[PDB]
Write an enzyme that holds these catalytic residues in place. Structure first.
Site, short mmCIF file in Angstrom:
data_model
loop_
_atom_site.label_atom_id
_atom_site.label_comp_id
_atom_site.label_asym_id
_atom_site.label_seq_id
_atom_site.Cartn_x
_atom_site.Cartn_y
_atom_site.Cartn_z
N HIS A 102 26.70 29.53 5.83
CA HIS A 102 27.99 29.14 5.25
C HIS A 102 29.05 28.79 6.35
CE1 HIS A 102 27.10 30.41 0.95
NE2 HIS A 102 26.31 31.24 1.59
N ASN A 175 28.06 32.77 -5.13
CA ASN A 175 27.82 31.35 -5.07
C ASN A 175 27.95 30.64 -6.40
OD1 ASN A 175 26.12 31.51 -2.31
ND2 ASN A 175 24.52 31.64 -3.92
N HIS A 366 32.63 40.60 3.03
CA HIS A 366 31.41 41.38 2.99
C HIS A 366 31.34 42.05 1.58
CE1 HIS A 366 28.96 45.22 4.03
NE2 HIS A 366 28.20 44.18 4.12
N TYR A 389 26.78 42.18 6.70
CA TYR A 389 28.04 41.54 7.02
C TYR A 389 28.98 42.45 7.81
CZ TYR A 389 26.87 38.55 2.76
OH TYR A 389 26.25 37.52 2.07
C1 HEM Z 1 22.98 36.61 -3.87
C2 HEM Z 1 22.75 36.14 -2.53
C3 HEM Z 1 23.75 35.84 -1.60
C4 HEM Z 1 24.99 35.34 -1.88
C5 HEM Z 1 25.63 35.01 -3.24
C6 HEM Z 1 25.63 35.20 -0.57
C7 HEM Z 1 26.89 34.61 -0.37
C8 HEM Z 1 27.50 34.40 0.83
C9 HEM Z 1 28.76 33.70 0.99
C10 HEM Z 1 29.59 33.06 -0.12
C11 HEM Z 1 29.07 33.73 2.33
C12 HEM Z 1 30.19 33.00 3.03
C13 HEM Z 1 31.27 33.85 3.67
C14 HEM Z 1 32.55 33.10 4.05
O1 HEM Z 1 32.92 32.16 3.34
O2 HEM Z 1 33.18 33.46 5.03
C15 HEM Z 1 28.01 34.48 2.97
C16 HEM Z 1 27.96 34.78 4.35
C17 HEM Z 1 26.91 35.49 4.94
N1 HEM Z 1 25.79 36.04 4.26
FE1 HEM Z 1 25.26 35.78 2.38
N2 HEM Z 1 24.80 35.65 0.47
C18 HEM Z 1 23.63 36.04 -0.15
C19 HEM Z 1 22.55 36.63 0.52
C20 HEM Z 1 22.51 37.01 1.87
C21 HEM Z 1 21.53 37.91 2.50
C22 HEM Z 1 20.22 38.47 1.90
C23 HEM Z 1 22.03 38.17 3.75
C24 HEM Z 1 21.63 39.04 4.77
C25 HEM Z 1 20.51 39.94 4.76
C26 HEM Z 1 23.21 37.43 3.89
C27 HEM Z 1 23.94 37.43 5.05
C28 HEM Z 1 25.14 36.81 5.22
C29 HEM Z 1 25.83 36.79 6.48
C30 HEM Z 1 25.37 37.48 7.75
C31 HEM Z 1 26.87 35.92 6.30
C32 HEM Z 1 27.85 35.47 7.31
C33 HEM Z 1 28.67 36.70 7.15
C34 HEM Z 1 30.06 36.54 7.61
O3 HEM Z 1 30.37 35.52 8.20
O4 HEM Z 1 30.85 37.45 7.38
N3 HEM Z 1 23.56 36.76 2.73
N4 HEM Z 1 27.01 34.86 2.03
#
Ligand code: HEM
Ligand code: HEM
EC number: 1.11.1.6
Lengths: 727, 727
Positions: A102, A175, A366, A389
């Site tokens: 993202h 999402n 987060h 996160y």
């Molecule tokens: C239902 C599934 C998921 C959804 C709806 C989701 C949604 C999102 C969204 C919307 C962001 C963007 C953050 C921003 O705009 O600053 C994000 C960032 C991120 N996601 Fe996911 N995610 C999913 C699954 C995962 C999984 C399984 C992992 C990790 C094991 C993950 C790790 C991260 C990380 C590391 C970031 C960047 C975090 C940050 O910048 O703070 N995500 N996710």
């Protein structure tokens, strides 16, 4: 000094203006009086400019900001120029790491407010009183491309909301589709590696049309429900304002008596659902890579604020095993026909940032940021996300004090015994930095759990089983929910899914991978399978022709909530129309057109072959907004060509193509008087056809036919015609 | 296991294949036997895969890589799953900071070799013997957009070469135009801030068509020479193979007797110079954002290696004030008519990386990386740059040991008394880490300067003057070199400059800024001024009409070396042609066409409306490479439509537009037999016209007319016709 033009024209009006009428500005400067509690608290770190001396970061004013210190004006630069070395050191270190997923993303400020108290189901204070409004910060994003990638790519979009509540920050990070691709968080690195640019050469950008993506899909049938969504028109939205949002996991609402309710969160777009079509969406990443960033900034400056309804799907704990899909499976959606979305409140986005890096790039969201009244479940993808996160911020944001970066700070109190770490802003006066302690009489103290303002306590769910790395058998079904999605689509929606798969798959170089994906489709529905297969030159095996279709989802055969266009809802407000001018435009036509549009809330762009201004037939001066090539049809919703000296633009290749592109992309075209000459260009019967409004003069009914087509978004009935057009 | 297809088709052939014939690969795997001294030394850090167990980073083999450790298969994930937490921690920390400028970029491996010994002018060992070949690593780049931005934007491109020499690393970091925008390094942050995305909303990406850019140009007349270059076709190249490179500063060559010579460095493209046209270049960033990254990777896999000539402009120290421009001014070019480029050696790029992040993203290039035999001058932009590229690595590459990152390591020895710092790889066994020392008998020791293998000693230039932050009066002239550039352009080249300025300026929202830029143009040349003014609806003031033109540059009125097309040079080799198939293609036509192309070194793409294969009239099977919509005309150089069952594609909108886009973008179109039906589409006289090759059958002369047009790159004579076409 001068440099500024006096007549004042360098500064925008601090009031709502239409798209492109003024230069855009910082939020504070464009909307000095949209305030809220988070916006007002950032006041302590806003820096102004006017009437201020240029200085070093140490406060020393600079006399010459054009030259380095050299021994003679053609000599060497001296190491003692501290003014030059500070200015170039901060430049050298501008960039922080981008989000590992993202990274693209666009954000705005606004608020949330509940419709009624939900105290019966949750003891969460932000939902306790309809009179309590909560500051939010929202960032919309894509998933694959870096921060420099284009906005209108085919991808899943993210939708993250930071709720600055009186009892803590609640981040709802979701999402725009209701299921994810993976069941277990352990596979997240393999899936993101497969979608991402390939390792040897880092191609492609912002695209899944590459071998590794489709390799991992063919070997992993759980990814297939969400790939169907990404392959639909759902993967190319018109605006962040024109999409649904979803939390995807089952969570818990805990009330003051201890009762837990499962919930799934929804965001319903009050402007309707609408998407681009792929040729349009793809060409537009070339023509304007910032289209989604731009149009959000400008809806908010025109006062067309984005609004969404927060909606809950509640399921009692007793019905945990009532469906034939596991509620803790993130690849399964709960049909609204089985469980309704109850509308709980509304969110309004009404203020842009002042500084994109500061506010938007440094924002940390987060899912583990929950408050009292909410809790987690054992969903295997939700449990892993929880680790992630917090971890990622230690390098992205340089350290354990990211919550002190101003966009991220609680607007409510936080006191605890955590000390030190990089760019520690708080100076702690507490004589103790450990508890239990007698020397500051144990402050700050722990709070017991209670109905309002109590400590966080987890829901006491029972756990029994062995330590196993093993997937639940209830997660083992990969095909009825993609076929439910498929059957709920209008016919042209399904066309567009066939064509999404066929384009992507044509870009896989290795043919066995494409065959492997068609086999999987034949387990979902054979019509789907046969259509894609055909475009690829693949034949289905008689055995593929005899695969038995998946079962229904609790006897449901279709749910129309899963389609974008089946039950219509449409903002015409905030949409944009292009008006093709010529040098003697008939003002009669023009003032009728613009009045009609203004009454409905629709924005016009007066477009010509040259910049500057033309003069209507009555001597009115019209300023030109863009050229035909400068603002393509790609960026508007409808085209109106008024009458006047038509001979002027009639022979112009750009003006004619403007109409052919628009025709093909299924947009309404309105031709007044002699403008009807162009029918011959887009090949229309004199007898007329739907979606082409034509008349002797632009008037009330002509405009009514046009705004009515516009509320219906595209002219879907033209899809058989558009194949013969070369545009 | 399986997962791999047996028939072996998942692996590419380890030999030169044409564009798109195979999946691309890591360098080592595609070209196991292209070796050189830097490539062989990276062998100690290359990691394989086959027949190896999946492990943690600590060597413990993993049994289940699909599931997290939970208490029961529907229960919570346990904090003691160390396998899951290591896998997600490394994911969470993948991204390092991107280059604060030039972040986009594409790199390859190869070598340099001198034509003769230059010992008479420089004691630089890499130039001392024609028999000494030197490993290089080269990264081509853009300037504005982030690493996720598109390749074919209008911008300056960078060209950085790392020379792994026996006496140290020499980095020659240059760009593709011969002057820069700014005279003094102190202004570099203000200029990069003005080109970059705007601060409040971060728009636009990869574009200078925005107010702040053009605001700073109108207020800073020294930027005008290089803005002319960026506004020319020079700002949108066809390939990194089809451009010139330049070091832009005056440097010194020091020979073994101490004599210093000023020099300016050039890179001459052995494939000729060629650029895209803007509608093409802009649409192509939507259609393929990785076009330049892709085509470099694939030229090298097809064996169409990039080659360049290193060329010197030498000026004796005595002629330092012979010109009427200051040699130390970076915004002034030295006309080749006054001083010739002497060809010194040749560079060949013949191997791609194995890992883009590792090799390409972690590469550090800095102009202060000079060797004995070279030295700097007092150029004010060169002196500041020197501070910067050491500084920036402390955050980009995490610390003072970036030279230990494997792509960046000297292939020759380096020993000194620098100790510690983050991810220190060398374990120093020296008992001393200071000199002077007796305990390790003063090793490693200082070396005196000498003819070969001596220490670095600076050239003893005389400095006299006061400590002043002041610009030399010799830098004060802003307009004769942009008019020399303008007068050396062919007529259609100048058209394209008018149109570059007119498009960009139409996108400035504030009109006083556009007027301010037209005033500046009227000081360069009034024709230029009037043309741009007209497209914008601006009138020139009679006083603007009476501005006296700048003086000549040392009586030179034009230099044709500054034009791309005036003296022709053209690779047809490595170019690409699209052949539009139908279902009964005449093989007579096809085998003639493909033989001709193969003899000249040109690549074909057989394109249809469906993937899979068609069968020629003689039953030959032809595999389809892309669809018409999948590989647009945008990505080839010429279109050939053979005869056969034409009725099949004749009514197809895509096949017809394929020809109209190509026509408009001034490409050669060849129509054999019934294929000539399509003349009616692109509106051609039966009598014919130039650039449309047509005949009864594809044969020898038909192909000769086509390859001849192709060596001339575009059909410039069509430019009057293309305005009436709507495509
Ligand atoms: C239902 C599934 C998921 C959804 C709806 C989701 C949604 C999102 C969204 C919307 C962001 C963007 C953050 C921003 O705009 O600053 C994000 C960032 C991120 N996601 Fe996911 N995610 C999913 C699954 C995962 C999984 C399984 C992992 C990790 C094991 C993950 C790790 C991260 C990380 C590391 C970031 C960047 C975090 C940050 O910048 O703070 N995500 N996710
Ligand atoms: C003649 C003018 C200049 C030329 C030809 C030039 C060229 C380049 C090139 C080709 C790169 C890309 C490096 C890569 O591919 O990894 C680069 C990077 C960079 N340049 Fe310039 N540059 C110029 C002026 C400046 C100035 C005045 C400054 C600083 C005061 C500057 C600071 C930098 C920095 C900080 C980077 C990123 C450095 C790095 O990543 O190692 N440049 N420049």
């Amino acid at each position: 000094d001068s440099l500024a033009p006096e007549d004042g024209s360098h500064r925008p009006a601090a009031e709502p203006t239409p798209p492109g009428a003024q230069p855009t500005a910082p939020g504070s400067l464009k909307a000095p009086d949209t305030r809220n509690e988070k916006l007002n608290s950032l006041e302590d770190v806003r820096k102004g400019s006017e009437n201020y001396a240029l200085t070093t970061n140490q406060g020393v004013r600079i006399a010459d900001d054009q030259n380095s210190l050299r021994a003679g004006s053609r000599g060497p630069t001296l190491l003692e120029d501290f003014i030059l070395r500070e200015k170039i050191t901060h430049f050298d270190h501008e960039r922080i790491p981008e989000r590992i997923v993202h990274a693209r993303g666009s954000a705005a400020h606004g608020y949330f407010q509940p419709y009624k108290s939900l105290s019966d189901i949750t003891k969460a204070d932000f939902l306790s009183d309809p009179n309590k409004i909560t500051p939010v910060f929202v960032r919309f994003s894509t998933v694959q491309g870096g921060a420099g990638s284009a906005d209108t790519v085919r991808d899943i979009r993210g939708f993250a909301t930071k709720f600055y509540t009186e009892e803590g920050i609640f981040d709802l990070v979701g999402n725009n589709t209701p299921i994810f691709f993976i069941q277990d968080a352990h596979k997240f690195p393999d899936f993101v590696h497969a979608v991402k640019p390939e390792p040897h050469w880092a191609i492609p950008q912002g695209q899944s049309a590459h071998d590794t993506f489709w390799d991992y899909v063919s070997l992993q049938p759980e990814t297939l429900h969400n790939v169907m969504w990404a392959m639909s028109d759902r993967g190319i939205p018109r605006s962040y304002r024109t999409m649904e949002g979803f939390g995807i996991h089952t969570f818990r609402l805990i009330n003051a008596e201890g009762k837990a309710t499962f919930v799934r969160f929804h965001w319903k777009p009050l402007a309707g659902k609408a998407s681009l079509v792929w040729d349009e969406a793809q060409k537009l990443t070339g023509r304007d890579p910032d289209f989604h960033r731009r149009e959000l900034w400008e809806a908010i400056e025109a006062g067309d604020f984005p609004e969404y309804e927060l909606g809950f799907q509640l399921i009692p704990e007793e019905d945990e095993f009532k469906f034939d899909f596991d509620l803790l499976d993130p690849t399964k959606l709960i049909p609204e026909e089985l469980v309704p979305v109850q509308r709980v409140g509304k969110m309004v986005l009404n203020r842009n940032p002042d500084n994109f890096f500061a506010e938007n790039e440094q924002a940390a969201f987060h899912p583990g940021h929950i408050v009292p009244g909410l809790d987690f479940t054992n969903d295997p993808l939700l449990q892993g996300r929880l680790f992630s996160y917090t971890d990622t911020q230690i390098s992205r944001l340089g350290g354990p004090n990211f919550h002190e970066i101003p966009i991220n700070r609680p607007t409510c109190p936080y006191h605890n015994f955590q000390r030190d770490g990089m760019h520690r802003m708080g100076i702690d006066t507490n004589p103790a930095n450990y508890e239990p302690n007698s020397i500051n009489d144990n402050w700050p103290r722990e709070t017991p759990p209670g109905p309002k303002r109590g400590g966080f306590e987890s829901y006491q769910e029972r756990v029994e089983g062995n330590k196993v790395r093993e997937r639940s058998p209830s997660f083992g079904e990969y095909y009825s929910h993609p076929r439910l999605f498929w059957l709920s689509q209008t016919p042209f929606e399904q066309r567009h899914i066939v064509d999404g798969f066929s384009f992507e798959l044509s870009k896989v170089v290795r043919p066995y991978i494409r065959e492997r994906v068609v086999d999987q489709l034949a387990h979902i529905d054979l019509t789907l399978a046969q259509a894609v297969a055909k475009n690829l030159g693949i034949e289905l095996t008689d055995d593929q022709l005899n695969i038995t279709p998946p079962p229904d989802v609790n006897g449901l055969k279709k749910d129309p909530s899963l389609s974008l266009y089946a039950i219509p809802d449409g903002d015409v407000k905030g949409r944009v129309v292009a008006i093709l001018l010529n040098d003697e435009v008939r003002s009669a036509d023009l003032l009728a057109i613009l009045k009609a549009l203004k009454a409905k809330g629709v924005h016009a762009k007066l477009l010509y072959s040259r910049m500057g201004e033309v003069t209507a037939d009555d001597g009115t001066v019209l300023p030109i907004a863009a050229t035909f090539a400068g603002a393509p049809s790609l960026t508007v919703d409808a085209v109106i060509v008024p009458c006047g000296n038509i001979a002027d633009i009639a022979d112009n290749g750009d003006a004619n193509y403007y109409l052919m592109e628009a025709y093909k992309h299924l947009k309404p075209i309105a031709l007044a008087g002699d403008a009807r000459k162009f029918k011959a260009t887009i090949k229309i019967a004199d007898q007329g056809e739907e979606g082409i409004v034509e008349a002797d003069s632009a008037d009330g009914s002509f405009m009514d036919e046009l705004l009515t087509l516009m509320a219906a978004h595209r002219v879907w009935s033209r899809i058989p015609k558009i194949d013969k057009i070369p545009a």
